[PDB]
């Protein structure tokens, strides 16, 4: 009866989350039972459509992590249907302006705070009769910062009341700045922009997150004060592990 | 226009294969593009049903590995439908007697050698008009040895003409012998039984394979002369990788 | 070769419809064979995506009710794809302005009346060669009225030619007015607003519908003159029935 | 970390279970959150195949009831794959002889007690490292008694060690005795046979269950001492509720 | 309220049926609306599993043809689940002996005639309260004759009461006789065997069918007196049509 | 490591493509292995949703044709998710203005040329490490011209840099001009408009394509200089073939 990520924050610690681009419930449950506070299902850069995300949300909740979704797009009705299917965290890609951040916020709150349509199929089962009064706190929302334009507008994006903060998309950000879309990059201009976004989010009293490709980079981001760190995509981790097993098996 | 595992054998080398318990096509293709000769899809100890295996076979072939299936049971009609869907290797669990091995063989060959029903939807597309004359060589078949009874009958199982050899199921074998079902075990009685099965398979001029849980154990099995080694399940590798990322991320 | 709801209206009677939030074809067919003129599939507050709605439309038609869909959003291309899959009634949520009602209408009619794209896969099978000339009459369209803004604009919404009328969303309406989102509510301000919408729809010569949570409330709405009444969601009815069976079974 | 039905029995009370013939996770979770100790998913007289049962098992567990399956057939490998997918109760239809009951038992226990193949994907996640030592107690197994032949063999069926008892299929039983396949029947010969099966099960120190079509009949069966009572199928309850809503809505 | 194939026979004419190896409902409905009396869904030499056949049965019935299934295997519980999903014709492959034909018959009739388990989800919806009394006539059953052994046993197979007759599998038959598995073959030994099976079926007062690859061969088979002729597989017809469109498009 | 349609163009020849409205992988692979340079999957006038298109893209690539998609709508995030799933050609319906064409172009190119979000799951597997530098050339994009408005704006649409040209939707075009939506029409006003669009595309140095319903019309369009011709929809070809088989089978 609490959003586990908001509980982390309320108790003074950051949240660490998993990241899934592979559809299915078995690895979703297995990873949720690890020491992840949340598991993000990626519906943008994956083949995961709504039909496949729906059972994954159930499996993550059963495993003991908060189910999050990184949506394909910042679309209110898409987001609302995910909320009613038991997504309790929303990360919306490519939020570039205050207006787009306001569009995200509008989907996450019932009237009068937002315009979310009422029919909370799975949240009513989880939270019971008192859901409506607490509905806003049960959901975490982050706008993604992935472009030069979003950087230009970062302070105005952070002024939006109905979202908890921002989540950096570091490979899109590097690419829009004219650099290789490398995860966990050392490119100075990108590193400086990421630091800037974190600094402005905290100056605004908001939360800031970042996508990480490795556990070591995630540790550094937590030390730098990021509130929400993801590490690392299931497909990337699986591919790297398989490569190493093969190398070990085929070595002389 | 060749079964990649049979090509390994024909050219004097063993085959290394992947092992999938997670449904879906994206990791199947990704792992098939690694230096695996084959990828086995587990339909016994997984939630992978026929509807989910079918596109995975396509994805593995596109990635450049031979699609194999470890079936739920040694059932001829199940096996035939997988063959016609483009499974080119069959590993049948719990083959305990010569008769059961003969049942496996019967499904893998058209008349007069076997009783496989003719309607090769996907193999005809892959191999073209000359498929029938070469159909038997396009498929690899292994009977699993997983019980004290299968050990008792190993020589008679190895005498069956229509199968390429046997594949050890080491956790079921350890359990039936009264030991912990530990993968890559050091338990002497199990280690001795595995060695015995390999020795009898090669005395019979047949192939022998084994399921491995690690790249290091797989390397040792290849050095011991196993013809077909799998390493390691996608879910196990992914879970271990995620555990390590979390440990690294949460370390001081 | 007639839309059953339009036939009700043409013959001077209202239509009663079912309401499905559970995916699947078996209960869809079973409920369609009851004395429902139509069955509405809810794609907003449910886990029903396009892949799951498509066979349900077939099952409802076979059962003998008109297949309707309450869409996730008022989006023209979404609506068109449902029409071509054999949805013959469209209820679009959150229609708040005349322009949005015009957007709904545009999707329901071929040129010159609307901009519906031509490729009527399933309607051509149902209606045969003369489909195009009769296509508009085969589809029923209702804009949902669920907000204070929609109330403010009700007369302008009702002036839109290409829609049959409006459908009240009473729990969203109550919530936007600052009241509990209770179905079949007695809250005076909500009751008055619902009556007002009905009165203006009929003053405009248009149809008006309402979502009901019980058979008794639906009877009263029919007596008040509503043209299209739904009662009641499959999940709600099933949950209530199960609760009662358990209470009866566990009673002393 | 306990099978909820076995906990009922261990604490001196019978278990009441739901019964699902409709695929999908939403009503499965909703009904599991009611005062059902278990929810049985029917894979015999339904369109529920393995691909659809798998997420339902997750949803039932999350809702707080023990997931049970009534299988299509008494087949060991089918049953094992369901166990590894997190079915913790198995009801096998048409068990007519002691040998068939022994076949059921064989699938529910690891060696040496049975021949269940080891690879417990979801039970290992639920129960953790100590699963193997407790695996047998985590699963409940009932053989169905549905024919004159099963009646003839009831004492020998009840002598089988690896099953918890029997579950009466009352409509098949009535039909094989030459009577209408009416649920909750009053036909004396059927009523007498049901009573006889219960009496012999308890004389054997075993559990006995029965399928019920109503809460009132279920109450009587509990009073008669049945250990496991199901009431009532989702589709039947939903259809009856819809019929009544329509009757109420269309009444003058 | 009649099986359309049995109606053909009762009115003195043969039945012509379609044959589907491609999953999906749209072409199933489209072909059922043509002058086919039935449409057979092939679950043996196709990727069509139960989850995909279920909506296809609905679509065929809506289109106006009798839904038939050629099963993967002659298995009673598989067949029963298809019957309860609304398959009204069963063609079982590889029926080689009288006993196997008796196994087929057992699944198609309730007690006392057979052992079919009672729970007719979709047939009860189609036929209503009087279903049980007429259930046997609503289903057509054919045993496939595809081997030298089935030829050897043809008279004993035809003596089985609970099946309507036999259905020749001509490519498997040619292959088992040592000839190319060519559809619509002219190979004298195969042609003679097919004629023999037809002659013995009619001498027995039973029905005989055959799989055809072309409309011209089907016409000849109807002239020869076959009672049930299929022509031709969706995939084969589609592939041939596409080849011709390409040839026409690319011609000078 | 080349887009097959762009290779046609680079080598001085047009491309011929298939057109699929039926979901599934088997006919997709079979048709891709014919002498089609590409196969277009129709997600507008079909029941093919994202979950069903994803494996079809794999099957088309394996068969040896370039996978194309005609999307439901010109939506950037939809298009991007298809690109990352291995759609290498995009045909967007109802592009009526230069701005809408600019929206299409924006989705097909990474920064700085467009705003495509980076996460190319399947293209990175196909093309390897050098994908980013060549990404734009790997994708073909065509805006559809289907309305009087698109005709009015054809020169401005053709001036858009990030698209390869236009694709005529001839049945929607005929309908918007007030004529029957007949494929391969002879209606002079439609024929003249189609010719005009081709002439302006080539005057602009751009590519032009057209949807065809027959191989003979496609041959004429290729002779007229169209760069991209599709012929003909799987469902239409299959339906026509089945009609002819039935006519041949039922003829005296
Ligand atoms: Br952990
Ligand atoms: Br990464
Ligand atoms: Br590698
Ligand atoms: Br392992
Ligand atoms: Br009724
Ligand atoms: Br309600
Ligand atoms: Br309750
Ligand atoms: Br019942
Ligand atoms: Br016809
Ligand atoms: Br054929
Ligand atoms: Br060709
Ligand atoms: Br066409
Ligand atoms: K956790
Ligand atoms: K503010
Ligand atoms: K490989
Ligand atoms: K031998
Ligand atoms: K009805
Ligand atoms: K007007
Ligand atoms: K419960
Ligand atoms: K005993
Ligand atoms: K017909
Ligand atoms: K007889
Ligand atoms: K090709
Ligand atoms: K330009
Ligand atoms: Mg990004
Ligand atoms: Mg094993
Ligand atoms: Mg609403
Ligand atoms: Mg029964
Ligand atoms: Mg055959
Ligand atoms: Mg068009
Ligand atoms: Na959308
Ligand atoms: Na089976």
Pair of tokens at residue D194: 């049901």
Q: C50-63 and C76-84 are packed helices; what angle lies between their axes, rounded to 10 degrees?
A: 40
Q: What are phi and psi of A86, to 5 degrees?
A: 95, 30
Distance of CA F202 to the CA centre of its chain: 18
Q: What are phi and psi of A62, to 5 degrees?
A: -60, -40
Which residues partner with D20 through β-bridges?
A: D41
DSSP-derived secondary structure for A124-189 = HHHHGGGHHHHHHHH-EEEEEE-SHHHHHTHHHHHT-TTS-EEEE-HHHHHHHTTS---TT---HH
Could you tell me how many residues make up chain C?
A: 252
Q: Answer yes or no: are the C-beta atoms of E172 and E149 closer than 8 Å.
A: no
d(CA D70, CA D43): 6
Q: What is the largest CA-CA distance in chain F?
A: 68
Q: What is the CATH number of the domain that holds F137?
A: 3.20.20.60
Instruction: Please list every residue in chain D whose beta carbon sits closer than 8 Å to the beta carbon of residue C243.
Output: 34
Range of the domain at D244: 1-252
Q: Answer yes or no: are the C-beta atoms of E170 and E185 closer than 8 Å.
A: yes
Helix (H) or strand (E) holding F133: helix F131-138
| DSSP H helical ranges for chain C | 4-10, 26-32, 50-63, 76-84, 98-107, 121-127, 131-138, 148-152, 154-158, 170-176, 188-203, 215-224, 234-250
E72 DSSP 8-state letter: S
Q: Of C1, C2, C27, C45, which one is the catalytic site residue? A: C45
Pair of tokens at residue A12: 């003074």
d(CA B90, CA D60): 34
| Dihedral of the alpha carbons of D117, D119, D124, D126, in degrees to the nearest 10 | -80
d(CA C139, CA C142): 10
Q: Which is nearest to E166 in space by CA: E190, E187, E146?
A: E146
d(CA D68, CA B175): 26
Q: Is F11 helix (H, G, I), strand (E, B) or coil?
A: coil
Could you tell me how many residues make up chain E?
A: 252
Pair of tokens at residue B242: 């995620």
Q: Which is nearest to F100 in space by CA: F34, F149, F64?
A: F149
- Distance, first Cα to last Cα, chain A: 54
Residue D132 to residue B181, Cβ atoms within 8 A: yes
d(CA B197, CA B200): 5
Distance of CA A22 to the CA centre of its chain: 16
A47 DSSP 8-state letter: S
Residue F29 to residue B54, Cβ atoms within 8 A: no
Q: Which is nearest to F4 in space by CA: F66, F48, F47, F57?
A: F66
Closest CA–CA distance from residue D141 to any residue of chain C (Å): 23
F129 DSSP 8-state letter: G
Tokens 């009237």 -> residue: A111
Q: Is B90 helix (H, G, I), strand (E, B) or coil?
A: strand
Compute, in angstroms, the gap from residue B64 CA to the centroid of ligand 15.
5
Residues of D with CB under 8 A from a CB of E: 21, 42, 44-47, 49, 51-52, 72-73, 75, 93-94, 146-147, 171-172, 175-176, 178, 180-181, 235
**Total count of domains within chain D:** 1
| Omega within 30 of 0 (cis) for the link into F232 | yes
- Resolution (angstroms) stands at 1.5
Q: Answer yes or no: are the C-beta atoms of B146 and B176 closer than 8 Å.
A: yes
Q: How many CA atoms lie within 13 A of F200 on its CB side?
A: 20
Helix (H) or strand (E) holding E1: none
For chain C, counts of helices (H) and of strands (E): 13, 8
Could you tell me how many residues make up chain D?
A: 252
**F152-156 long-range Cβ contacts below 8 angstroms, 24+ apart:** F153/F96, F153/F97, F153/F98, F154/F196, F154/F197, F154/F200, F154/F201, F155/F200, F155/F204, F156/F97, F156/F98, F156/F101
Compute, in angstroms, the gap from residue F99 CA to the centroid of ligand 24.
12
Q: Which of E72, E94, E178 sits opposite B81 (nearest CB)?
A: E72
Phi-psi region of B117 (alpha: psi -120 to 50; beta: other; left: phi over 0): beta
Q: Is D217 helix (H, G, I), strand (E, B) or coil?
A: helix
**Annotated catalytic residue F45:** yes
Residues of A taking part in catalysis:
45
Compute, in angstroms, the gap from residue D47 CA to the centroid of ligand 32.
15
d(CA E116, CA C196): 58
d(CA F82, CA F90): 9
Tokens 């919408």 -> residue: C197
Could you tell me how many residues make up chain F?
A: 252
CB-based touch D/F (3+ pairs, under 8 A): no
Pair of tokens at residue B241: 């990788």
Residue D50 to residue B45, Cβ atoms within 8 A: no
| Dihedral of the alpha carbons of C125, C128, C130, C135, in degrees to the nearest 10 | -20
d(CA D74, CA D90): 10
| Dihedral of the alpha carbons of F93, F98, F100, F105, in degrees to the nearest 10 | 90
Helix (H) or strand (E) holding D166: strand D165-168
DSSP-derived secondary structure for E132-169 = HHHHHHH-EEEEEE-SHHHHHTHHHHHT-TTS-EEEE-
Distances (CA, A) of F60 to C249, F49, F63, F80: 56, 16, 5, 19
Instruction: Please list every residue in chain F whose beta carbon sits closer than 8 Å to the beta carbon of residue E47.
Output: 24-26
Helix (H) or strand (E) holding E58: helix E50-63
Q: Of F45, F109, F179, F196, which one is the catalytic site residue? A: F45
Experimental approach: X-ray
CB-based touch C/F (3+ pairs, under 8 A): yes
Residue E22 to residue F18, Cβ atoms within 8 A: no
Q: Answer yes or no: are the C-beta atoms of D116 and D110 closer than 8 Å.
A: yes
Ligand (nearest to CA of C248):
7
Q: What is the largest CA-CA distance in chain C?
A: 68
Closest CA–CA distance from residue F53 to any residue of chain E (Å): 13
Q: Which is nearest to A75 in space by CA: F44, C146, F77, F54?
A: F77
Compute, in angstroms, the gap from residue F98 CA to the centroid of ligand 28.
65
Closest CA–CA distance from residue C226 to any residue of chain D (Å): 12
d(CA C210, CA B215): 64
Chain A interface, best mutation among D24, D26, D81, by max A CB count within 10 A: D26
Instruction: Please list every residue in chain F whose beta carbon sits closer than 8 Å to the beta carbon of residue C132.
Output: 180-181
Residue D44 to residue E85, Cβ atoms within 8 A: no
Q: Which is nearest to B247 in space by CA: A231, F27, A13?
A: A231
d(CA C58, CA C36): 16
Helix (H) or strand (E) holding F75: none
Phi-psi region of C128 (alpha: psi -120 to 50; beta: other; left: phi over 0): left
d(CA E228, CA E251): 39
Pair of tokens at residue B40: 């086995």
Instruction: Please list every residue in chain B whose beta carbon sits closer than 8 Å to the beta carbon of residue F28.
Output: none
Q: What are phi and psi of C83, to 5 degrees?
A: -60, -45
Residue E125 to residue C55, Cβ atoms within 8 A: no
Q: Is D20 helix (H, G, I), strand (E, B) or coil?
A: strand
Q: Is C168 helix (H, G, I), strand (E, B) or coil?
A: strand
Q: Which is nearest to F138 in space by CA: F119, F158, F164?
A: F164
* Residue B158 burial (CB count, 10 A): 24
Compute, in angstroms, the gap from residue B19 CA to the centroid of ligand 15.
13
Q: What are phi and psi of F131, to 5 degrees?
A: -60, -50
d(CA F147, CA F170): 9
């Amino acid at each position: 009866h609490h959003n586990k990520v908001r509980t982390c924050w309320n108790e003074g610690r950051p949240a660490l989350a998993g990241w899934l681009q592979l559809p299915g419930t078995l690895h979703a449950e297995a990873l949720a039972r690890l020491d992840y506070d949340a598991v993000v299902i990626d519906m943008q850069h994956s083949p995961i459509d709504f039909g496949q995300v729906a059972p994954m949300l159930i499996a993550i909740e059963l495993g003991g992590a908060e189910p999050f979704v990184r949506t394909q797009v910042n679309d209110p009705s898409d987001i609302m249907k995910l909320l009613d299917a038991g997504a309790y965290g929303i990360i919306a890609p490519m939020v570039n302006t205050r207006a787009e951040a306001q569009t995200l916020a509008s989907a996450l709150h019932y009237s009068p705070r937002g315009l979310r349509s009422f029919g909370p199929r799975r949240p009513s089962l989880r939270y019971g009769s008192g859901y409506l009064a607490q509905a806003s706190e049960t959901v975490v929302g982050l706008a993604m910062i992935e472009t030069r334009e979003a950087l230009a507008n970062i302070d105005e994006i952070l002024s939006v009341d109905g979202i908890d903060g921002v989540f950096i998309g570091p490979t899109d950000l590097a690419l829009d700045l004219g650099h290789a879309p490398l995860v966990d990059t050392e490119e100075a201009e990108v590193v400086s922009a990421i630091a800037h976004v974190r600094e402005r989010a905290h100056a605004a009293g908001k939360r800031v997150g970042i996508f990480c490709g490795s556990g070591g980079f995630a540790r550094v981001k937590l030390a730098e004060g990021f509130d929400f760190v993801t590490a690392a995509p299931d497909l990337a981790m699986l591919s790297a592990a398989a490569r190493q097993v093969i190398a070990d098996a085929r070595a002389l």
